[PDB]
Structures are given as C-alpha cells and as structure tokens.
Amino acid sequence: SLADLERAARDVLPGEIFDFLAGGSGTEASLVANRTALERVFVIPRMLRDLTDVTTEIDIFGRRAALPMAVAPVAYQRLFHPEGELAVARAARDAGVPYTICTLSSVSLEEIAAVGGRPWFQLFWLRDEKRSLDLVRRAEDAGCEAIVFTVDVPWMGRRLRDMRNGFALPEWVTAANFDFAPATWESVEAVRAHTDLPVVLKGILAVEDARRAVDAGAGGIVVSNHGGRQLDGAVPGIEMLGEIVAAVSGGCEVLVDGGIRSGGDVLKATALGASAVLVGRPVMWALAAAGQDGVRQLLELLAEEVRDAMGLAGCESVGAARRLNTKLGV
Amino acid sequence: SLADLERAARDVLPGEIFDFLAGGSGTEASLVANRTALERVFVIPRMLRDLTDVTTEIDIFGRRAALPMAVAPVAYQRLFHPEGELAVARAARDAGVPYTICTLSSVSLEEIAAVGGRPWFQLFWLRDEKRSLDLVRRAEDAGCEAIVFTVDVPWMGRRLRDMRNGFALPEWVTAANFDFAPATWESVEAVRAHTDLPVVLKGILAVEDARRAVDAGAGGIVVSNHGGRQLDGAVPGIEMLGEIVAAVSGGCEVLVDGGIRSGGDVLKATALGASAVLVGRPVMWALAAAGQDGVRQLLELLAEEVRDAMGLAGCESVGAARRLNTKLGV
Amino acid sequence: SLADLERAARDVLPGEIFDFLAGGSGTEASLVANRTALERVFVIPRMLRDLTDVTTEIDIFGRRAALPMAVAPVAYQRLFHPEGELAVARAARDAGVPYTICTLSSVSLEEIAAVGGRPWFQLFWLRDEKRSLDLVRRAEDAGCEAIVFTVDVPWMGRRLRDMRNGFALPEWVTAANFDFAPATWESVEAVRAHTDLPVVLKGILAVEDARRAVDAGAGGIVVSNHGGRQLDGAVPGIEMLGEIVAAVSGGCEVLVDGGIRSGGDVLKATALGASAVLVGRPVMWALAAAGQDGVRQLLELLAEEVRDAMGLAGCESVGAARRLNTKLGV
Amino acid sequence: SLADLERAARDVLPGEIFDFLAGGSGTEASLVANRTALERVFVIPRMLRDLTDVTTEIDIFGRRAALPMAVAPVAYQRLFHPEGELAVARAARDAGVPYTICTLSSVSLEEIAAVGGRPWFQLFWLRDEKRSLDLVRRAEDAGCEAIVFTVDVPWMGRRLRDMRNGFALPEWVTAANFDFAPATWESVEAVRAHTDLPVVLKGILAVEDARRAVDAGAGGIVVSNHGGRQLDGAVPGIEMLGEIVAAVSGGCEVLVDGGIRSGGDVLKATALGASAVLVGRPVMWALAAAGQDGVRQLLELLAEEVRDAMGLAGCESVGAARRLNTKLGV
C-alpha cells in the first residue's frame, strides 16, 4: 500500500519539507475532506463478465496511457530528492503514465521533456501575457502534449504549517525555468489561440465553470481543490465530479484529483465519471523514499491495484468502470 | 453473545491464522462497512400479536431449516481446529442449520456430506468446464441439496494482513477435494444445465445482476461483498438488499451475509427482506474455541437470540418478520 | 443538572444494582440510540411573545399535572433505597407529577396509592385473565386514575449486564402485590371493558399500532422502546413520535419516553408533538442518592428547566411548545 | 489564526472569567453546534474572474464598513482587560468595523461613542418602557447609528459553568450605563416609533419571526442563538440563514453570528446569504491577550483572511460572494 511509503518519506525528509508536502491551507478542512469524501463512496461491482483481456489503458489528449492516471504537477521536486523531476519523469515514462512538468520545476522543462515519455506542461499565468505564451511555446517545442493551465491560484493559499515553520526554499532549489498574475478567461483564450495542444483547466469546481471551460475550447478540466492547499473550505473535487460530468456531456475530458491513494480510489473516481485521475503527494513520498526506483515501485503497485479493482468490479476496460454505479455510505 | 467467542478464538489461534480469518482486502473499508451498515438499521417492532406458537423455521431449497440461517462457506477449516469441517458440519446438522461444504474444504466433500444434515456445496469455477461440472456431480451424488456458485472471485482479493504476515497454508492443511478461472454467465448456464439442484449465486451486489440471476434460472442469490475480502470499497450487501428484494419480486430466494453477529442482526436482515442469512467468521471463532461443542453452543445462542428478537418484534414466523419496517439511524 | 445525580447514585449503589438500573438489552444499541436521537433534535425558538404568565401545567387523563411529565414505571424501587416507592411517590405528589405504580412494585399498590397525589397503575398481563383484571380492579379501588398497560414485554429482554453479574433480586425485595403471559389486542379489550379509567398502552413504536390503539379505545399511548431494555435494535420512540402524532390526529394522548434528562429534552419531545413524557432512570438516581428529598430536588430542577426552556423558546404554555418547529442536526 | 489567541487568553485570564466567556447554557449543545454547522459547509469557488480590484467593503445601515463584519455585543468587557470597551472600540474604529456598545457595558456608552468610528448600540428591554426609550435616546444623541435590540433574552440562560464556579461580577466591574423585562413585538414598535435609526433584532431563528421583523419595520436582523448561551438545543443561526434570507427577499439586512472564527467562515456565511457577520468571543480573546493592539491585530488578520478567501473563491466583492453556491459535507 501507499501508506507504507508515507512513513518512509516522513523518516527521511526534514520535518519542514515533509510539512510543505503534507499541508493544506487554513485549518486543513479541505485537505481532510478530500479523503473523507472518497471514503464515503462505495462501488456496486458487477459479476460474471468476461475478464479474459482486462486492460487499464486509456486514450487521452491524443495518446495512449497505461493507466487512467497522470502524475500531478508538484513544484520544486528537488526538495524531496536530489534527482527531483528527472527521477519522477523517468519512472513515469517507464510506467507509461503522463508526467506533468511544472512551471515552477526545479529542473528546466526542456531537460525534463528530454527524458521522453508523455510529458504535459502545467502553466501558471505570469505578469506578462508575452512571457506566459513563451513558456507555452517552449513547452510545445520541447514535445509536451498538453497544457495544464492552473486556474485556482490567483495567488497562493495561506499555508499555516509553512508560516509557523518559517519555511522557505533552500538556496539549492530554484525555479529552473526562469533566469505572476491572476488568470482570467481572457488568459485561457490567449493560450488556446497560441497552441494546437489541448488546453486543460486545472482547479475547476463549479458546474458553470466546467461548462464555460468547454465553451472556451478546453480539451479537458481537472476537478480539484488543489489538494486542500488553496481555499480552505472549498468542496472536494470528488463531490462535484458526477455533476460536472453530466453537465459537460462529453464535451471535454474530465479529470479529478485530491486524495487518490489506491487503485480502489481510482476505481471510485472512474465510477463517478472521471476520464483519469492525478496523483500528487504519494508520488513525492515514493520519490523521497527511494528516488526513481521508489516512484517506479509506486506506479507498479498502483497499476496492479487498478487492474485488481477493475476485475473484481467486473470491468474489462476503463469505459466499463465509468458505467459502474456507486452508493454513498456513512 | 458472539463477542465472548471472538476473544476466546484470539487467545487460542496463532496470530497469523486469526488474521487470515479476521482480515479483509485493501484498507478493510468494506469489512468495517458490513458492521456499520447493520448498526445503522433499527427495527420498528409490532406489539400485541399472538406469539403462542413462535417458530424460527423456514423452508428453503426444498427443505426445512431450524433458523433462517446457514453456515457460510469458509475454506480450510482445519486451520482453526483439528476436526475442521467435520466438527462444524456435525454441529450444524444437530442444530438443523444447513452447512455449506467448500470447494477448498480441508476434508473431502464426500466425508463431510456423510455427516448427514442439510449440506450445500460451494463451487469455485475451475480451469476446465469438465472438472467444474465433475465437482458439481460429486456434490450432488453425495447428497448436497444446493450448489452455491461463488461469483465474486474472478481472482482473490489482496489481503494485506496475509501479505504482511507472509501467511501460507500449513503443510498439514490441504485442499482435500483435489488430487481456477473466472466464472461468467456462460459458466452459470453450464452448471444449471447439468444439475437438478438449485443454483445459488453468491456475491451479487448490483440490482441488474440479481435480475439477470433470476432470468438465468438461479434458485437463489446471496447478496454479499464476501465479508469485505474481495473488492475493497464494495458496498455491503445489507445496503443493497432491500432494492434487490424488490427487483426480483419473488423470483428466487434472496440471502444476505456480512457481519451478522446476533439474532437481532438476523432480524434486521429479515426485516430488510432476506429469506435467510449466512454466518461466517463467528462459526470459525466457535470452532477454534471449542470444536464441535463450541459451534453447537454458538448455534444454540443464535437460535435463542433469533426467537427472542422475533417475539419482542411481534413476529410469530419469519414471514412476519419480513413484513417488519425499519428506519435508518445515525 | 441530572448528570450530577448519576454519579452520586453510582457511588452509593452496589455495582450490580447500578447495572440492573443502567443497562439495556443486547449490545445496548437502543439504549444509546435513545440519547443520540434526542441530541440530534434542535428546536427553532420563537421570540417576542408574551411570557407574563408562563405555565408548565397540562391536563391529562382527567387531571391537572404541574409539568408535562410523569414518573415512569420502574419495578422494585426498594432496590435503590429502603423507602422505595413510598419515597418516590411522596416527592411526586408534592411536585404535582403523576407517579406510575408498578405491577412489580416492592411496596403494595394500596400503600403507594395511600400516599395520595395522582397515581397511575402499570399493568403486566398475568397468566390468568381473571387475576389481571383483579389487579386492575385493585388499582381502580385504590384511586389510581389510569391503567398503563405495558405491551412491549411478551417476555423480558436479555439483559447481558444482569446475566454477566448473575444478578437476582435480593431476598429483602419482593413483588409486594403478590402473595405472566404475552398480552394481545384481546387483552387490551378485556381491560378496556372492565374499567372506566383511561387505558394507556406503553411500548408502541409502529404507526399502525398507534392507530389501532386509538381504534381499540385507548386513551393514550407511550411511544417507547422500554428504555432500550426490550428489543435491542428497536427504534427510539422519539424517532417515531412525530409520525405517530400525525397518524392519531388527536384521537388519544401521545406520550414518549427514553433518555429524557433535562427540561430541554422535555421541550424537544413537546415540540415533536408529545402530550407529556415519562422519566425513568433519573428518578431512581435521585432516589438512590437522597431518598425522598433527592427525588423532590430532581423534580424541582426539572420544573425549573422546563419553565426556562419554554420561555426561552417563546412558549407561555405547553400547547404553544407543541407548535414549535424542529430541525435535525448531525 | 484566531486559534493562537484563544490559548493566550486562557493563560492570562482567571479560570472563572475564561469560563464566563467560553461557556454556553445547559449541556452546551448549541455552543458546539455553532461550530459543527460551519464545519459542514463547503464553498464552491469560482475561477478566472477579474480580481484586479477585490474589495471587502460593504454598505450597511447607512455607512461603509471595511469588512462584512461587526463586533458583537459582549457585556462587561473590563472583565477581560482594564481598558475594556474603550480598547475594543478604538481598534474597531481604526479597522473600519462597527462596534456594538452594550446596554451592560462596563464603560458608559457616551464614553465609548466618543472614541468615534461606527458605533451601534445594543438594547436590553428594561422594566420601564420609559427607561428603555431613554437608553435609546442616549445612544442616538451620542452618535450611535443603529439600535441592536436583543430579543432572545426574556431572561438569562442557565450557565452551568458560572453556577458551578459561583461566578459573580467583581466589585471593580459595574454596569456603567446605570446609576429588566421580557421584550415583545409591542416593545419593538415602541422603539421603532421613537428613533430614526435602523432597528436590528438580534436573536431571530424562526422564519416567521424574520418575516414579522420585516413587517414590523426592522432594518435588519441577526440570525443567532446567542452564542449557545440562551436556549440549549436552539438551532444554530447558520442552519436557518439560507431559509431566512429567501423569506425576507431583500426586505432587511440579514446578519448571522455564532462561531465565526476565520475569514473562510465569513465567506461561508456570505455564501449562505448573510449581509454581514458578528464576531464575539475571538474579539474578547484578543482583548484579554493584548488589549487594544490585540484586537487591532485580530481585525487585521480577519481582514486579510476575508480578502484571501474571497479572491480564492473568485469574488471581487461581497455581493459576488453572496452569489456563491455551497454544498453540505459530513
């Protein structure tokens, strides 16, 4: 289980860095709710279906992925291990999972993309529409296959663990893509007009924002409260997911994140209608604990857990898993 | 109470064997939910009815049973006591309760059936349609009166207690019926075509699978998440039971299992519409603690608890108990 | 508060007697649910109403009572104090609260009634229709003003505290009215035909049993699960009360019991539609702790708490309190 | 966070005074429910809106306030610090927040009003309609801009912490406005006829009392259970707020109080429809801990938390925050 890795990472990382990773904003209400919400979801499995060729593969944004999952954008991964983003990206490539390269990556995006695999690029909107679009163009020129535009960070949430810790970036970690302003719908349009890559808006929670994202020409959204790190009291994405999937009615891919910690959790998200999930903190636990081989082992365990869960639920494909029904417990 | 027995069994059994017995898959969410779900159910008892002739008997699959209960299939019972299945089967016979002989029994099915009583036989689908049907034919020739086809095990769930324990069958426990593949609806048909015994599909949770089971010629189903040992996050059977009973509308017997630990719990399952229940772990606690006489004492306590509960609720018969209403609490 | 008294009684009483008093049947699910259910109820108070003449009085079964409350039937009160029922009955009389004399009283019913006040008499149905009716006639001849026919005890619930304790009546406590069989609707009719007193059926939880009680000529019912001492898993009366009040639509008085521990709890029961409440265990705590003066002090504290709660909620009368709305919390 | 201040105040204040401040009535059910209720509310934030000019200002009762918040009436503030109400009022003025001067203030209302800022005056109805109206006239002559008529205190709730503590006002704290009777709707009319200031009824929880308040010519209400200090078991205001806002349909300002402990909580109240909130206990923690500068720091932290929350939720104005949707969690 992914629970094994969390303790291993707690042991190795400096306390303040473990807190930067684990923490949420405010009283951590949304952080805790991400888990509570998943725990309340029960799947109604189907029996006696053909499982001779169970596959966890999906096609997303033009490409085959080995699982309905990608590595979430997590800034400054050298905080957790000296190889940082390169270790994660290599493991992701080898697992057939898309890796999201961050605007605030601690290794340059061009170096990360050179690893190969299916890199996506996460955008934070800069000060200058021109620099933002340069970053997009860099990503595209480097072979990234989607732009994950983070839209829930007009500014950063108040992380009281960091404030209490007086936590700051070590001098040996930098924003390697560099030598910020709130995004609007106009910024989305500027991005969409300047790339042929799918634009994916990350941090959508309202139904009318999901519909507007489709109208705006997004190729996907990530239904997300940013891992409980942005508005404290924001609803978990998993609680809005079903309503959002019904509202877009196939008009874009609908991803979800927040608290996904097992293959069963992936199955739950799928059954609620998600195209795929992102996974954040667990990938960093595996990185901290054992570098590249740590993340590879995590991804292999997830792969096995997702296949197991699907077959136990009577699903030979992710599409079938999306047609599962659920029941909320207490 | 059945709680007495659990500690007695914890004291006598080797830790790893107690864990094989107690554990569920994954994070044990479905294991815990089986109990939570029962605990939330309240019965609305009726008063002032004639109780001069209260009976707990039912007719099921051709035969009278003393209680609306059978012993669930539990593999490898010599793990818990040296007399294993023979001790349980004798106690069951003497109590007038059906005993389910397992495909993976640690005493041969013919020896268990020779004990007498009302044996049923649980089938796991083998590799070879021909060997599966041989096992069915053996059971029928031995006098088993129903085939309990387990349909929730295309493969085994990941039991993290066993994995952590590195638990494996002792060399002194074997699958005595021997000298596996996923089941499908085609396998059900092959069984149904080859026996005149009622075929009971164990591990149904979806309403449309219950209806299809009727259409397929099943004589019953067991609404079950396999004691929380198969898909972690599968809904408890008790949560689907009422919906399933309404959907089959008398077309087959509808049994339930998972967490039944008292006569009051039997009453709750009955009031939700179950024809009968299966009981698993408590029977093995009694076996571990005191062998045959242990299981006899358990069954006598259950019998007394079921009669007590029925009469306190104004029910002179199990049919009347099925007409009780319930209310969900928090 | 009534919480003060509970510890005082725990200190003075022998453990096994405190357990006889405190305990419920089975796993004590219904015992705990009585409290949970009250705790979930919130009152919506009204403001700015005339409170110049707030009164807690009600008319019930022909007579004025000082509060919408009576002392519940509790058998064998000499278990708790040497003066037993006489101490409780005197305090009740002095407080203007009806006292329920038990069939299993440890002082004869005629002695208790001689105390004066507003005694009611609780009936358990005997073996012999003739002896049952004699007991009723005795009660009526002694000046009791209602027959509280307990209808939830075809036999006694399994009290595992008592069983574990091997608890039995001390030799110095006897059933003083003596020198039992399940009740039916026919028994109710026999009682109703033989007395002009109001017949009150205690232990009704199903709506159709409440309606039938009206049809049967009951002058009241007590919506009750017998303090969690009868069917373990029976719904709390407070959860059925609103539905029952709507169903009888003024055809009899509807009382409730189970867990009433404050004037606020009385207000909650009133707001849900109860005519009055019974209070059991707290009266015995006060008796154990301080005899007659103990029960008087309890009743004075309740009186003050009920007036306080009513006025804070804008109710000058109990009728107004019945028109309060409520909201369920979590 | 406001949690920092609570411990600081616990350290400095005498135990019995900390209890006078913290406590509620009865079993403190309503006190705890105020927090529970807020914790169950999740906001659905909006993204990608223009936040170039985020403002937390509102217009209320004729005047601009810097935040959608006022300092609640809290009697006898010299209990917490020697400068008492003057320290709080100065900080409030400097923060641009209305300060509610109490009828039971420990510094005279004219001295508090001389501080300047936006003082409101809270009225308790006196014995004598003439003295009540004198107090109103004093407040108006001193420059108070609204009368906050407390309508939930026909008398004081039973504060068991105070009773247990034998707590009484120190001899060095007095009701400085002096040298009481239950309010009715007639008292509201007498106030409304005698002032041109907006009359705000504090302690409304029933929908029909909110509508009647509008009909009566109130310029606002405060939906409130008096911080859990009046009826124990009264619903939290936050649970009635949405229903009340829909019922008045713009006919008066609708404020709420009870448990507001962060800017996120203000956002939640706004999203449920509140015009503004009151904050009580936290202001007294800050006063106790650090006098005037303590309250100033609290108000600055709240201001920053409210702006943060609004912008993270896509709201450039409080009006926009009122149009946010919410979802209840568990």
Ligand SMILES: Cc1cc2nc3c(=O)[nH]c(=O)nc-3n(C[C@H](O)[C@H](O)[C@H](O)COP(=O)(O)O)c2cc1C
């Ligand atoms: C340490 C940390 C840094 C993050 N950095 C970013 C970021 O730069 N961009 C972004 O869009 N999301 C960022 N996220 C949020 C994740 O992409 C994701 O939404 C969240 O972590 C998912 O929740 P999970 O960690 O519970 O799986 C970060 C998350 C964490 C924990």
Ligand SMILES: Cc1cc2nc3c(=O)[nH]c(=O)nc-3n(C[C@H](O)[C@H](O)[C@H](O)COP(=O)(O)O)c2cc1C
């Ligand atoms: C140790 C163990 C072994 C089991 N073996 C089998 C099996 O061979 N076949 C099967 O259909 N169910 C099997 N089950 C599941 C039970 O038949 C039953 O569904 C479950 O135990 C009921 O839950 P309960 O144990 O809470 O009463 C097993 C259960 C346990 C605990």
Ligand SMILES: Cc1cc2nc3c(=O)[nH]c(=O)nc-3n(C[C@H](O)[C@H](O)[C@H](O)COP(=O)(O)O)c2cc1C
């Ligand atoms: C020790 C004990 C003895 C009781 N004896 C009787 C009885 O003889 N007849 C009866 O109708 N109810 C009996 N009751 C139940 C009470 O009348 C009442 O329904 C229950 O105690 C109410 O719950 P409360 O104790 O929570 O207030 C008894 C209750 C207790 C605790």
Ligand SMILES: Cc1cc2nc3c(=O)[nH]c(=O)nc-3n(C[C@H](O)[C@H](O)[C@H](O)COP(=O)(O)O)c2cc1C
């Ligand atoms: C110590 C104390 C004294 C109070 N005095 C008054 C008062 O004189 N008048 C009034 O209307 N409310 C009074 N209140 C209630 C507050 O105005 C407010 O409704 C409540 O404190 C809001 O809850 P909060 O403290 O959780 O923020 C008092 C509250 C406390 C804690």
Ligand SMILES: O=C(O)Cc1ccccc1
């Ligand atoms: O997006 C986040 O929660 C992580 C982050 C951390 C530090 C600086 C920018 C972003």
Ligand SMILES: O=C(O)Cc1ccccc1
């Ligand atoms: O069916 C089960 O949960 C029990 C089982 C244990 C070991 C091997 C097969 C089946």
Ligand SMILES: O=C(O)Cc1ccccc1
């Ligand atoms: O009615 C009850 O719960 C109390 C009781 C105790 C002992 C004998 C008869 C009745």
Ligand SMILES: O=C(O)Cc1ccccc1
């Ligand atoms: O209104 C309140 O809860 C506080 C109060 C305390 C003491 C006296 C009057 C009012």
